[PDB]
Amino acid sequence: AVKIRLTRLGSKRNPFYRIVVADARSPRDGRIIEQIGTYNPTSANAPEIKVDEALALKWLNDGAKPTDTVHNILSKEGIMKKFDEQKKAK
Amino acid sequence: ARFRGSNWKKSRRLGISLSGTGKELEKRPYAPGQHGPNQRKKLSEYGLQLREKQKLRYLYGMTERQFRNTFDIAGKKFGVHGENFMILLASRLDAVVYSLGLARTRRQARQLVNHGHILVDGKRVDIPSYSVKPGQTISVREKSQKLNIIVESVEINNFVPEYLNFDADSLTGTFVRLPERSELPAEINEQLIVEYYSR
Amino acid sequence: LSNNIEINAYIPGIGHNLQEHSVVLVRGGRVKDLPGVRYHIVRGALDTSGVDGRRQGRSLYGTKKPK
Amino acid sequence: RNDRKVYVGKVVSDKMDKTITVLVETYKTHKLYGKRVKYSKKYKTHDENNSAKLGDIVKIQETRPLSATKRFRLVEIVEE
RNA sequence: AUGGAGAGUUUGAUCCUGGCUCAGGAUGAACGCUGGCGGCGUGCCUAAUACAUGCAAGUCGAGCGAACGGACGAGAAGCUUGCUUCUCUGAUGUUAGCGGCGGACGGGUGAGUAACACGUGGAUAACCUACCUAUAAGACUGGGAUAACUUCGGGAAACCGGAGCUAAUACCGGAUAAUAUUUUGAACCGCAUGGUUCAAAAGUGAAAGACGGUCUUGCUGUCACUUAUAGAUGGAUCCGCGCUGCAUUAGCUAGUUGGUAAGGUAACGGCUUACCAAGGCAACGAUGCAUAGCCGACCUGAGAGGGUGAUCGGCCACACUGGAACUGAGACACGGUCCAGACUCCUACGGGAGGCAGCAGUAGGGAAUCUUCCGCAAUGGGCGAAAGCCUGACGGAGCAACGCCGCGUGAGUGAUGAAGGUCUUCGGAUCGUAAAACUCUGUUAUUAGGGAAGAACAUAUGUGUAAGUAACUGUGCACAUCUUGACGGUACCUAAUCAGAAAGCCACGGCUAACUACGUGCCAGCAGCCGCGGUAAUACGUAGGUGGCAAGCGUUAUCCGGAAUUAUUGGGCGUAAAGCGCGCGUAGGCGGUUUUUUAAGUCUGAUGUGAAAGCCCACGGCUCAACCGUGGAGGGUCAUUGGAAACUGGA
Ligand SMILES: [Mg+2]
Ligand SMILES: [Mg+2]
Ligand SMILES: [Mg+2]
Ligand SMILES: [Mg+2]
Ligand SMILES: [Mg+2]
Ligand SMILES: [Mg+2]
Ligand SMILES: [Mg+2]
Ligand SMILES: [Mg+2]
Ligand SMILES: [Mg+2]
Ligand SMILES: [Mg+2]
């Protein structure tokens, strides 16, 4: 189905990722529905994470499902709690 | 370095002392080789443009590819192209080290940077082509503080340009600001070089 | 040629080893003196030997470095 | 509701049954020279009552495919 | 204002016209000579030729029967209490088969396609959509089989046939349940057809369990199941406009154009079929022929333009050739099926087997294009509750100066201008501060130690919290803990030793930077053009010297430039190429003055959109750069909507 996942960029031995909403059948570095953020694993010994809460929450509401690393990111940024809180509150 | 040929022959051909002292031009101020002593026919307009370009290139000991790339990036900046090219040439770690006076020769300064003796902002920079920007501090590696070459060069109180600020006690220089055309070599007519690269 | 077109190719350099049934590499370039010759034989490629004793512009005539 | 495209043209054929052919004239600027050149397209249109006649200005709106070639219907007759 | 160079060659000389040629940039390049390293890329363009071999798609025991394995541990003493059997229990496990899901993705290629294929902008009151999310309502009551298995039989084989037996979240009946279907009331609404909403009947349509918790003659957690309605996603159709050469291709079409009715499709529709009519298309290029995947982009150019469509991303098409359907949410399906054909292979001659335009690799073709590698550690995908398994996707490694960028092959001092080579006016001059000598350095190299990031996790294990419950287990969420790296002991770092191992290529008459000697003598040869060479060649070949570049330098091929030589920007037609021999005129192009009006062109805004990557600009990260990342800017002949009205158009 619809998935929030990391698309690989950068160069050899220098990964950079864009956090994107994509259909699963889509190729990893191919067609996407929307980009929500970025993730840099190799940056300054601290993962650098940019995410749009408004976009991430809209997609999580509509049934988009994170890959495991993306879930960790949305947890680190606090989006996964917000999703739960609203959903329980609903 | 990269070009490792006779610096005198190159000076004599180009009618300019690459060492900046005139030692090459003192005895034989004419082109090298068999026909050097004989009269030289007048240079064409292309000949003059090429001569001026080669003068600047051999002065900074750069290869043509790199020289042309530097000319391009200089052109992309704001202001007068020729002047921007010359200040950008002067901003090379090579040139900065030489002008600070950590070496007595440009080739020596290049070997110093290339062999990893030099520090920029406390960290090792080994690329002679490195483009030093204003505010950066050039230093000597802690191990190399007592090199005979460096100490002797610094002892010889070479004039340090105004855009730099050297402390001989600490062997630490500072790239204070961008050079000015006044501070840059006066024997170069950069306009000819711009014209050369136009055609 | 391999495309089956018959052409006249110039043989450059001083001296050649080529005979009928030799296999050769042909490049572009016409000889102005010779009317029908619109191609050159490449020296030092396939059967064609390099010019012997060529010591200047050897790459053009397929000669290895003398040393 | 989203709006379907509407065109105005002159009826050039009324021979077919419940159908009129409408010639819509537009200008295509030349890519290089920049002069506008008159261009015409005949649009096959549905005229249920066979109301329109050759030489009458008509207003046509886009529809679902009504035939092999017919994609438009007659909204009104502007002039006769 | 950021951006624009010319030169040679028609003559005795000249000005002009005019073609030809060159200096530049670019490449998936190839070839010749030569060759140190690193980073980041790129690498069958030709035969959509044929393909040996391994691998590229599985997974699920928490759907199911069955089989294997049989722990822990049951009995007798062979007097061997360490070895024994079936008279048992039989745990963690494992698998062939059934069933579910996946296999329609990912990966490859560009043959076909001149087309709504694609690009851009719209439409669907003519559509469809597994998994995912949300909400609501349910999951009741029965049945008959069949793999595996057992046995028999037929085949060379591939693989079939009979009998018997057996499960399921397999299959089937009935019940109950629709906004679905029919019919009848309304109400409101749009853009023809029509949309929407609310009532009253009629016919008709579902489902399923598994693994756990508990207070266990009954509740419940998670997952699975069914129906209805939305969302999300993906797909389908239609249309405006844009998108290719040839008229020495001018006519083309009969399901053809339209209508009617019926059938058919998710769906509109000649989509199809009967019937009726004669339409439809075309000089605004139909039809035919040739060629071609299209685009984002890419190369060049001051620009306007011109050329191109590798790598990467999007869309399309194809899967030995041709046809067809089946299964399914989705295929008319690269590693599915059936048939025909060609080819290859096996055979007991009866009959069988197969499809690298997946990754490697081979043969062939070609000027020319890589290893039959490592790992699922990362990212992504399938299956599973999950661990996990599968993954030639992908991450890495290998090979190749193929490209781009970076750094080397030493540095300082050095007249005593040594020797030697070359030239010479025999004075000398040049190679040449070059060398040697002396001093110094270690990029690199070599050797020896240290040694990253990339890793997030998932799971499991605690604690808390939220919803729900009688409560619990679970579930979501939050915070802790252990553990996981192919590359790889790689990058990088440190120390020690050593100038030692690390420069070639083309050119030097002019364009065009750089000349002499000797040999040769219209020969041998050179050559992009002007040309050069027939005895004192800066043009041949070699040598010395020089010039231009540099791990490259040259050559060839091809594209843009210069070429204002198709000229919109930006040329011409008396004599240079060029005014139809001349009328009458059709289409078309163009058109006097004023006022009023309109607003199609024009001008000025707003809104949506013109993917990402790229180009450009800025900033940040890699020791620098290349490269990587991020944010802007730009790119329409775009659509929609609001103004202005001089000019063009309309009235
Ligand atoms: Mg083709
Ligand atoms: Mg131009
Ligand atoms: Mg398949
Ligand atoms: Mg296959
Ligand atoms: Mg280089
Ligand atoms: Mg030659
Ligand atoms: Mg032109
Ligand atoms: Mg004439
Ligand atoms: Mg006349
Ligand atoms: Mg973009």
> Burial of A58 by CB count in 10 Å (0-12 exposed, 13-18 middle, 19+ buried)?
middle
The CA A24 to ligand 3 mean position distance, Å, reads 19
The CA B64 to ligand 5 mean position distance, Å, reads 10
For chain C residues 12-31, those near strand E by a CB cutoff of 7 A are 12-15, 25, 27-31
Chain A neighbors (3+ CB pairs < 8 Å): none
| Rg of chain D over all Cα atoms, to the nearest angstrom | 14
B104 touches strand E (CB under 7 A): yes
How long, in residues, is chain C? 67
Nearest C-alpha neighbor of A70 from the set A26, A25, A22:
A22
Task: Say how far apart CA D46 and CA D61 lie, in whole Å.
Answer: 10
The 3-state DSSP composition of chain C as helix, strand, coil percent (nearest 5) reads 5, 15, 80
> Burial of B131 by CB count in 10 Å (0-12 exposed, 13-18 middle, 19+ buried)?
middle
Task: Give the strand order in the sheet containing C26-28.
Answer: C8-10, C37-41, C26-28
Which bases of chain E are under 7 A from a protein CB atom?
2-5, 23, 31-35, 39-41, 105-107, 122-126, 130-135, 190-193, 231-234, 237-243, 256-260, 268-271, 278-282, 284, 304-306, 312-315, 365-367, 378-382, 393-397, 405-414, 417, 422-423, 429-434, 439-443, 452-458, 466-467, 476-479, 493-495, 504-507, 511-516, 524-532, 541-558, 568, 588-590, 600-601, 611, 616-618, 621, 623-625, 627-630, 637, 640-641
Count other Cβ atoms within 10 Å, centred on residue A23: 13
The nucleotide lying nearest B109 (C-alpha to C1') is E411
| H or E segment and range at residue A22 | strand A14-23
For chain A residues 42-81, those near strand E by a CB cutoff of 7 A are 42-43, 45, 47, 61-65, 67-76, 78, 80-81
Count other Cβ atoms within 10 Å, centred on residue A67: 14
The method recorded for this entry reads cryo-EM
List b or e across D61-75, with b for residues whose CB sees 16 or more CB atoms inside 10 angstroms: eeeeeeeeebebbbe
Resolution (A): 2.2
Phi-psi region of B110 (alpha: psi -120 to 50; beta: other; left: phi over 0): alpha
CA angle C33, C36, C40 (to 5 degrees): 75
Give the domain extent around D63.
1-80
Pairing of strands A65-66, B118-120: unpaired
The answer to whether B176 and B160 are in contact (CB under 8 A) is no
Task: Say how far apart CA B73 and CA B197 lie, in whole Å.
Answer: 13
The CA C3 to ligand 1 mean position distance, Å, reads 21
Measured CA B173 to C1' E412 distance, in angstroms:
22
Measured CA A27 to C1' E330 distance, in angstroms:
18
Q: Residue with CA nearest E441 C1'? A: B115
Domain count within chain D? 1
B34 touches strand E (CB under 7 A): yes
Say whether domain B89-175 belongs to CATH 3.10.290.10. yes
- Amino acid making up residue B37: P
Task: Say how far apart CA D39 and CA B181 lie, in whole Å.
Answer: 63
